[PDB]
Amino acid sequence: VGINVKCKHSGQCLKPCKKAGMRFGKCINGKCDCTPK
């Protein structure tokens, strides 16, 4: 999916991910990638 966020913590990506409307937000190469349903 990919969101306009930076992976500071594997779990922090959840916070902007709920704004994305996705399920969870995992840490990707420096960035935050969300998991859809």
UniProtKB/Swiss-Prot annotation:
Residues that bear Lysine amide: K37
GO CC annotations, alphabetized: extracellular region
Domain remarks in the Swiss-Prot or TrEMBL record: Has the structural arrangement of an alpha-helix connected to a beta-sheet by disulfide bonds (CSalpha/beta).
Disulfide bonds: C7-C27, C13-C32, C17-C34
Family label: Belongs to the short scorpion toxin superfamily. Potassium channel inhibitor family. Alpha-KTx 03 subfamily.
Keyword Signal in annotation: yes
Protein name: Potassium channel toxin alpha-KTx 3.6
Organs and tissues of expression: Expressed by the venom gland.
Keywords of this entry: Amidation, Disulfide bond, Ion channel impairing toxin, Neurotoxin, Potassium channel impairing toxin, Secreted, Signal, Toxin, Voltage-gated potassium channel impairing toxin
Cellular localization per UniProt: Secreted
Organism whose genome encodes this protein: Olivierus martensii (Manchurian scorpion)
GO molecular function ontology, one term from the record: potassium channel inhibitor activity
